[PDB]
Amino acid sequence: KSPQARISNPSQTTQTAQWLLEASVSSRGEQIYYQYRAEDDTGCEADEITHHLQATAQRYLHIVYYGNRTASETLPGLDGSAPSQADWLFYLVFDYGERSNNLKTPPAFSTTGSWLCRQDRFSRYEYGFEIRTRRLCRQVLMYHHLQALDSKITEHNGPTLVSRLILNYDESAIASTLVFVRRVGHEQDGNVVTLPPLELAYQDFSPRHHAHWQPMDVLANFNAIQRWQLVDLKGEGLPGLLYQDKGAWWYR
Amino acid sequence: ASDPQCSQNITLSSDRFGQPLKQLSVQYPRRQQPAINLYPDTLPDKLLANSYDDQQRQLRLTYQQSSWHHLTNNTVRVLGLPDSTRSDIFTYGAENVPAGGLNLELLSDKNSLIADDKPREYLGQQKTAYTDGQNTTPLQTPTRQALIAFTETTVFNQSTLSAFNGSIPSDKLSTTLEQAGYQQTNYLFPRTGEDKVWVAHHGYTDYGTAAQFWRPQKQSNTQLTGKITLIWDANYCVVVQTRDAAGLTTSAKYDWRFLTPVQLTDINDNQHLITLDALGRPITLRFWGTENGKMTGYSSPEKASFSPPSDVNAAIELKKPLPVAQCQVYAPESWMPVLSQKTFNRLAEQDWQKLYNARIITEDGRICTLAYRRWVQSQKAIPQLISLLNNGPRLPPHSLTLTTDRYDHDPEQQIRQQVVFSDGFGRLLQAAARHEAGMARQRNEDGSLIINVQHTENRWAVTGRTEYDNKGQPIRTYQPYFLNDWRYVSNDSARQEKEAYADTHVYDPIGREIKVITAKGWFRRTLFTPWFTVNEDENDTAAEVKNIDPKLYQKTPTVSVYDNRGLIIRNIDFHRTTANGDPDTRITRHQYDIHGHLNQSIDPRLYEAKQTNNTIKPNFLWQYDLTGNPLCTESIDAGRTVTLNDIEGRPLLTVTATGVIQTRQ
Amino acid sequence: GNKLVTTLRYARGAWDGREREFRGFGYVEQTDSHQLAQGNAPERTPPALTKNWYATGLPVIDNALSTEYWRDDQAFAGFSPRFT
Amino acid sequence: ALLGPYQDVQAILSYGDKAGLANGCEALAVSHGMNDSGQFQLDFNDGK
Amino acid sequence: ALLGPYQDVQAILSYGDKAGLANGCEALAVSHGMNDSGQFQLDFNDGK
DSSP, X not given: OOGGGEEEETTEEEEEEEEOXXXXXXXXXXXXXXXXXXXXXSSXXXXXXXXXXXXXOSEEEEEEEEEESSOXXXXXXXXXXXXXXXXXXXXXXXXXXSXXXXXXXXXXSSOOOOOOOOSOOEEEOTTSSOEEEOOOOOEEEEEEOHHHHHSSSOSTTSSEEEEEEEEEEOOOSSOOOEEEEEEEEEOTTSOEEEOOOEEOOOOOOOHHHHOOOOOOGGGTTOOTTTTEEEEOOTTOSSOEEEEEETTEEEEO | OOOOOOEEEEEEEOOXXXXXXXXXXXXXXXXXXXXXXXXXXXXXXXXXXXXXXXXXXXXXXXXXXXXXXXXXXXXXXXXXXXXXXXXXXXXXXXXXXXXXXXXXXXXXXXXXXXXXXXXXXXXXXXXXXXXXXXXXXXXXXXXXTOEEEEEEEEEEOHHHHHTTOSSSOHHHHHHHHHHTTOEEEOOSSOOTTOOOEEEEEEEEEEEOOGGGOSOEEEEEEETTSOOEEEEEOTXXXXXXXXXXXXXXXXXXXXXXXXXXXXXXXXXXXXXXXXXXXXXXXXXXXXXXXXXXXXXXXXXXXXXXXXXXXXXXXXXXXXXXXXXXXXXXXXXXXXXXXXXOHHHHHHXXXXXXXXXXXXXXXXXXXXXXXXXXXXXXXXXXOOHHHHHHHHHSOOOOSEEEEEEOOOSTTOOOSOOEEEEEEEOTTSOEEEEEEEEOSXXXXXXXXXXOEEXXXXXXXXXXXXXXXXXEOSSSOEEEEEOOEEESSSSOOOHHHHHHOTTSOEEEXXXXXXXXXXXXXXXXXXXXXXXXXXXXXXXXXXXXXXXXXXXXXXXXXXXXXXXXXXXXXXXXXXXXXXXXXXXXXXXXXXXXXXXXXXXXXXXXXXXXXXXXXXXXXXXXXXSEEEEEOTTOOEEEEEXXXXXXXXXXXXXXSOEEEEEOTTOOEEEOO | OOEEEEEEEEEEEEEOSTTSSEEEEEEXXXXXXXXXXXXXXXXXXXXXXXXXXXXXXXXXXHTGGGGGSOOOTTOOOOOOOOOO | OOOOTTOOOOEEEXXXXXXXXXXXXXXXXXXXXXXXXXXXXXXXXXXX | OOOOTTXXXXXXXXXXXXXXXXXXXXXXXXOSXXXXXXXXXXOTTOOO
C-alpha cells in the first residue's frame, strides 16, 4: 500500500511491479507491521554514482513490528502512517552496516550508523527498469519493549536486545555468500554468551591454480570451418557433433 | 515375495474447499496358503501352519462422514471449521473383494459395499460446540474467532448399554448416565432406524472479550469438575496466577527477555526460582518456604547471591556452603578446540590478524574448522599454530549440574556432581556421577581409555555411553564403569580396549533392531514378516556358538501373529522338556472386535478343551464403551466385574465379581 | 568417526516447453550407506534403497513409469490419474 | 517433405495443354525442391 | 566428412567404356570430397 512497501519504476511511481507485505492481522487481534527501507546512496563508491545512480530501487526489510500492545482486529497498515515503536512490544531488526557486531555489550536498537555498501553489487532488469541492490544484511537481531511487558523498568527499555545472529560473508566482489553464522546473546552486565558458529563452504574457483589441458582426440576431424556444428540433438543436454552434408546429415 | 499385508486409504468425497467429506480406510484380507512357501527359513514347521486366522482375512472398511463450516463474504473468510464427524465399521469376506481390489469408482457404485446402505457397526461421533464467547448456547454458525464452548463425543449406545450385562438394572443405568453427565442425543449423520446415543460434553472453555484479545479465561475437563481460572497479564500473552476451584492459587514472574517464567509460588506460598542467562538457558535454582510454620530454604538471592562459573572445572572445585542448587554450567563449545592463550599470544603477535580476518580465530579465541582447513590447504599456515591447535583438547558439547541439598549455607553433605555429554545431532552420548574415592579406569590426557584401574578421589561412574549410526539409531552402548576423571574419553580407544564392555545393535533399513550382539557372547534376534514376528532369546541364539544343552532351546522362538490391523491374535510358544523331544506347540489365542478392543482371550489348555466341550469360556471376555473403556471383564478365574465411569474418567460405581456394589462421592 | 553417506540417482526428467519451465524428475533413487568407523562390528546395518516415482505431469513419461515398478501378480490394480 | 539419408525425390511438372510451346518446354524435372527447376543451372540469359 | 580443409584426397573416378568419349572425358579427378568435380571451376555452359 504505502510507497515503502512497493517496487516501482523510479521514473513513474504508478508502475508498481511488486507489492510487499505491509501489514497483517489475525482473528485473535494479533497483528504485525512491516517496515522496509528503500535503497539509496548510502556510502556508495564513485562508480555507482557515476554510472547508474538510481536510489529507491530495491527495498530492504528493516524492522518488523509485532506484539500488539492494544487489542484490535483492524489491519495495522491503516492509512499508511507508520506506527511508533511504542505501539509495539517486539521488534525484528535487520542490520545492513548500522552498528558493530563484535561488541561485548549488545548493539543498540537505534543508531546513526549508515548502511554500508558491499563489494558484491548487482541489478535486475526484468521489470523494465533497473533495480539495484547494493548490500546484504550483516546482522539479524531481536528486541523487546521491556516496560510494556513489566511496567517497573526504567523508561529506556523500549529497545532491549534479546538475541542476535552474526553474519559473515565472503566478499570476493565477484560474488559473496554467507560463510559463518553465530548465535549470540548478551548479559545485562556486558558479557558475551555464545553457541559455536555454523560454518558454510562454497565451491572454489581459480583458473590460475586449476586450469588443466587434455587433447580432444575424440573430436578429431570436427571442424567449424566446414559443415560441422555443435548441437545437442536426440537425447539432448550435451552437444554432439553435427555434420551437414550435401543432402544428408550425420551426427555423433 | 508373496503374502503381503495390504492397506489402502480412499477419499470418497470432498467439498469445494478440499475437505474430505467422506472417507474410507481399507484393510485387505490375507492371501491364502500358497503352494510354495517363501519364508520357512529356520522356522519351526508349525510357525507357518499356525499363522493363519480368520482375523487376518476379513475385509475391513472403516467409513467416516464429516462436515466443516466455511464462512465467507467480501471481507471475512474462514475455512475448514469442523463441526461434525461420524464413524462406522463394515466387515466383508474375501468374496467381497473383486479382482484388482478396491478403488474409488467401485466404491461409489450404487451396489457398493457402502453405497446401498449396508449394515455397519457404529463406532462413534464427535461435534464441536462453537461460541462467540458471549453465550453458553452454541452457535449454529461459528464465528470468525471459532471459539469453542466444548466438544461432544459418544460414549454409549444400545450395544454398550447391553455391555453392562446383568446386575445393572436398566432404570439405574439410564439414571446413572444422567448423573454421570452423559446426555442422550441424535446422530450428526443419522441413518434410518437408529435411536439416540449417549454423549459427553467436555473440554470447556470460557473466553474473554476482543479488548483482551480473544483469550480463554476459564476452563474445565467437564461440568462434573471444578472450574478453574487464570489471569492474563497486561499484554494478554502471559498466564498469571492461576486459581483453583478450591480457592487455591499459584503465581509466577517472567523474565521478559525470554517471556519465560522464572519464579513460581505454589499453593502453600513456597518459592521456586530459576535464573536465565543471555541465551535463555536455566541457571540454577533457589527455593524457600516454611516447614512447620518455620522458615527454611536456600532463601532469596539478596541473602543467597550467586555467580556460577563458566569454567566447568571451577564448578567441580566448588565447596559445600553454596546458596543454590542444581547449578548449570553450559559448555556448548567444549568440542571447540582452544589454543593455549599464552602460546597463541606468542604466535598471535605476527599472525593474529591473518587468522582473525580469515575467521580461523574468532574474537573470543575459538577456532573454526573450515577456516583452519582452508588456511592449511592454501599453505598460508604456520606449523606452530597447527601444532597448538592439534594439542588443544576437545570434549563433546557438555554441561554440568551441581546438586545441593542443604538449606541456607549450613553444610554437611557434599555436593553431587553430574556431567552430561551430547553430540551435534542433539543425541546424548554419556553421563557420569561423582563418587567417593576408590578404584577407577585410567585415561591418557589425550583421551585414550585405559581398562586398568587405580585409586583416586576423582572417581566418576560413567554410564549410558553411546555411539550412533548418524541416521537415528545407537550402534554401540556401554556398560557402566568408573573413570578417574569426568572428562569424555575417545571412542577410538574405547573400541581398542576390548576388555571394556559394550553391546552392538544391528538394524534393518527401517530402524528396527534385528540383532543385539552382547558382551555376554550371545545375541538376541528377530524376524519380521507381514503376519508375524519371531523373537529368539539368548538360549536359542546361543545354540549357534556351535549349561543346559542349547539344543533344548534351539528353534524355540516366541512368535507373535497378527491380524490385518496389526493386532496380536496368536502367541506361539514352544514347549520342550528335553533337547531330544518334539515341541508342544502352545498357542494363546486372542480375538479383537468393534474398535479393536480385545474381545476375548484363551490359553491353549482350556482352548483345546473348548474344542471338544463348548462349556469352556475364554479365559477372559470383555465388554466396553465407545471409547474403549473396559466396562466389564469376565474371567474363568475371577468372575465378572463391572465398572462405570463418569465423563471425567472416574468410577461412580463398581460391582465386584462377588456382587459387592460400591459407589463414590 | 562414523560417516553416513547417501547418494541420489536421477532419471526421466523433463522440460514443460509450453510454459518454459522444468517439471521435475519422473524418477529418483536414494541409496543410503552406513560407512561406520572401524572397531565397531563385523556386521553392520546394511545399505538400502528408496525408489521414488513422481508425476512430471507429462503422460509421455508418467505413463511409462509404471514399467519400472517391482512386480507382484497378487497386487491390486495400479492407480491411474483421475480427472473431474 | 522429409527425405531419408541420401534419398532424392522424383517428380515431373507438366502442362497438358501444349500448343505453340517450344519442344521440351511442356515439362520440368524436379529432384530436390527448394525452388527447384528442370535445369542444373537456371540461366535467364540462356537465349532459349 | 572424410577430410578437413587442410587434407587432400587423391582419387580418380573413371568409366570403363571410354570409346565414345573425347580425350580426357574418360575420367574425373577427385581431390576435394564435397560435391567436387575433376575441374577447378564448373560451368555447364562451358563450350567443352
